[PDB]
């Protein structure tokens, strides 16, 4: 609240300093921001405690940055950490005390939890509460009465208005409890699903699963893990532990196929007990319990084919022990979020690898599913070797003079097609691909503009893939990339970042970017995180190049796009010039070729 002569807020008169400040490695700002030391001997204990009570926002190598909020404190209470149980240790760890503001915030957030519980039974959602005064003073606003369908006091609530009531309670200061007591539940018989000994659970996976199962009752929340870290395995383990009917929701055909494959590989459950509620193919969804389907189908708003209507009615009628949702970052979308209310589930677990978006709808996930239970430390995984180390780099390509002339002259938005296609970046990508090809490194080129992708691919006679590409040709190209030594590069379009199971690649060049999309950046980066059989963290075998054009809007987009990665800790090294480019022969070495490319770009319209 107090501002120094500079921008930083003043806290000299706010909180004191502990005498043994050197011993205490923890800081506590009044706003809730906490700065932990990664060099302290008790760093591991401090990390565990701060991860338990707070969500990371920036975890560089030296000083980690966390911030706590109501959702994080509710998650702490869910895993069973009381207000004293957290605040006493927070004061002990803190080297400068705990401000009264944070003290009262923690007390209020902890006490305002568990008073209101939401439990669905016999397809009816009852708002139970041991304390009756909570309901007595909660029925002040008319929205509760209109929403409601027309000790231990409970009342039934309308299915459709659950989301509205939950978001209302969040700001009403009485969070709802979504814990599932699968251990004590006889209404829905347990499913015959077990985890085979073959599956191996990594320490971070086990920690995330523990945070989810803080107690005997499973907690509904979101666990963010890298795509290469085995989030599919974590979800399968969660379903197996729940031992009740599980509905996994993918985002595409590839996602559902991969989910079925993961289920069969890691769970002893028989093949016949798994169904694919997919329009392309179905396996008698009503027949078995464990189901894999898609948001588009479940939230489909237009006409429903009679068979799918029967399946949808069956799904609505039945109650699901677990609702796994992969790629939760798309949930807050209108149709996708409608699925949450369409289907009934005790706990709706969420898994993803890029929980970031521009529109401020990510906060809605906290109530749509639950608090962010776990968020894996990418740097720690890199050190442990579970994830391939990546030498993140941004190659600056100076824009050609004529191209810059037209780009600046035109105030329209042909610049997206223009600066994405310039001779300098073309030569840079050509030279980089040549260097990695002679180095036997697998290349996955990326480009949002299909026009630019096709032009580059024809000029380099490479197998570009994109949306309306035939599925058979897509599979053939991927198989050739994985097996044929003569080819070691594939030019994938935006479809690549959506969802795929692609072979591990040693480099990932991105000539063009869709825009300031942290989601796309992280999605494309996750491709090369696949750990090799015998690599090492320090070898930096994996490389990521984000080619950008100097003095162009692409620079702003790249800087706005690398925020999530830098927050994780990746250091994007800038490359102004590439050694050997002048000696190496490359296309567009003369003014004329740039002229024809510019003419084609202009005629593109």
């Amino acid at each position: 609240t107090k501002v120094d002569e500079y921008g930083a807020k003043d806290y000299r008169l706010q909180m004191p300093l502990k005498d043994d400040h050197t011993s205490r490695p923890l800081w506590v700002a009044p706003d809730g921001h906490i700065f932990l030391e990664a060099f302290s001997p008790v760093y591991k204990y401090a990390q565990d405690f701060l991860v338990a009570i707070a969500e990371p926002v920036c975890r560089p190598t030296h000083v980690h940055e966390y911030k706590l909020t109501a959702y994080s404190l509710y998650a702490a209470v869910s895993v069973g950490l009381q207000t004293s149980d957290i605040t006493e240790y927070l004061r002990k760890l803190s080297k400068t005390g705990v401000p009264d503001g944070i003290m009262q915030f923690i007390k209020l957030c902890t006490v305002s939890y568990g008073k209101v519980k939401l439990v669905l039974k016999h397809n009816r959602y009852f708002v139970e509460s041991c304390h009756p005064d909570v309901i007595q003073h909660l029925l002040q606003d008319p929205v509760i009465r209109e929403c409601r369908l027309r000790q231990t006091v409970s009342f039934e609530v309308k299915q459709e208005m659950i989301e509205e009531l939950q978001k209302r309670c969040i700001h009403l200061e009485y969070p709802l409890l979504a814990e599932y007591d699968f251990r004590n539940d006889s209404v829905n018989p347990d499913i015959n699903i077990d985890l085979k000994p073959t599956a191996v659970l990594r320490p971070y996976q086990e920690k995330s699963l523990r945070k989810m199962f803080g107690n005997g009752r499973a907690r509904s929340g979101v666990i963010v893990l890298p795509c290469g870290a085995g989030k599919s395995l974590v979800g399968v383990t969660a379903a197996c532990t729940v031992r009740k009917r599980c509905l996994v929701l993918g985002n595409s055909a590839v996602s559902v196929e991969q989910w079925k494959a993961q289920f069969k590989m890691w769970s002893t459950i028989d093949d016949s007990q798994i169904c694919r509620f997919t329009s392309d193919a179905k396996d008698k969804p009503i027949g078995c319990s464990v189901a894999i389907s898609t948001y588009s189908m479940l939230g489909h708003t237009t006409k429903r084919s009679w068979e799918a209507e029967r399946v949808m009615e069956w799904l609505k009628t039945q109650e699901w022990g677990l609702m796994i949702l992969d790629e939760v970052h798309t949930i807050p979308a209108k149709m996708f979020r409608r699925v949450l209310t369409i289907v009934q589930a005790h706990c709706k677990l969420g898994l993803t690898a890029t929980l970031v978006r521009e529109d401020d709808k990510i906060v809605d996930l906290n109530f749509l599913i639950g608090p962010k239970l776990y968020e894996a430390n990418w740097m720690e995984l890199q050190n442990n070797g579970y994830i391939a180390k990546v030498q993140c780099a941004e190659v600056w390509c100076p824009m050609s003079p004529e191209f810059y002339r037209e780009y600046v002259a035109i105030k329209t938005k042909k610049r997206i097609l223009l600066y994405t296609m310039n001779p300098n970046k073309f030569r840079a990508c050509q030279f980089l691909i040549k260097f990695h090809e002679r180095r036997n490194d697998k290349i996955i080129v990326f480009a949002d503009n299909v026009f630019a992708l096709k032009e580059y691919a024809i000029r380099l006679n490479k197998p570009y893939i994109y949306g309306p590409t035939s599925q058979g040709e897509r599979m053939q190209i991927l198989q050739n990339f994985k097996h044929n030594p003569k080819i070691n590069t594939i030019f994938i379009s935006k479809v690549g970042d959506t969802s795929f199971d692609l072979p591990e690649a040693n480099v990932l060049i991105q000539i063009s970017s869709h825009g300031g999309s942290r989601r796309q950046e992280a999605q494309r980066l996750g491709r090369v995180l696949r750990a090799k059989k015998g690599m090492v963290a320090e070898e930096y075998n994996a490389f990521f190049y984000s080619l950008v054009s100097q003095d162009t809007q692409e620079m702003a987009y790249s800087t706005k796009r690398q925020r999530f990665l830098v927050d994780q800790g990746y250091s994007f090294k800038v490359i102004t010039k590439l050694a050997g480019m002048e000696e190496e022969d490359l296309a567009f070495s003369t003014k004329e070729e740039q002229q024809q490319l510019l003419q084609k770009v202009l005629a593109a319209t």
Binding site: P398, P401, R405, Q550, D551, T552, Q553, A556, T559, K560
Partner: protein
Amino acid sequence: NVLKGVLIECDPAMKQFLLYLDESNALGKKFIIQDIDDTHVFVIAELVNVLQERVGELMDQNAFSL
């Protein structure tokens, strides 16, 4: 002939931006007296400060505000 002013050298992209400026009369005058080379141009001394301000605005456009 002899012409007064200043000579500014920059990368070809900035040179092309200056050419666009003079051609489109963004500053209201054809300040580019002559083009010494692909990376060198001549501008009137009095206008240099505002030209540099315009270049700074361009940098603001092409750089994100962290």
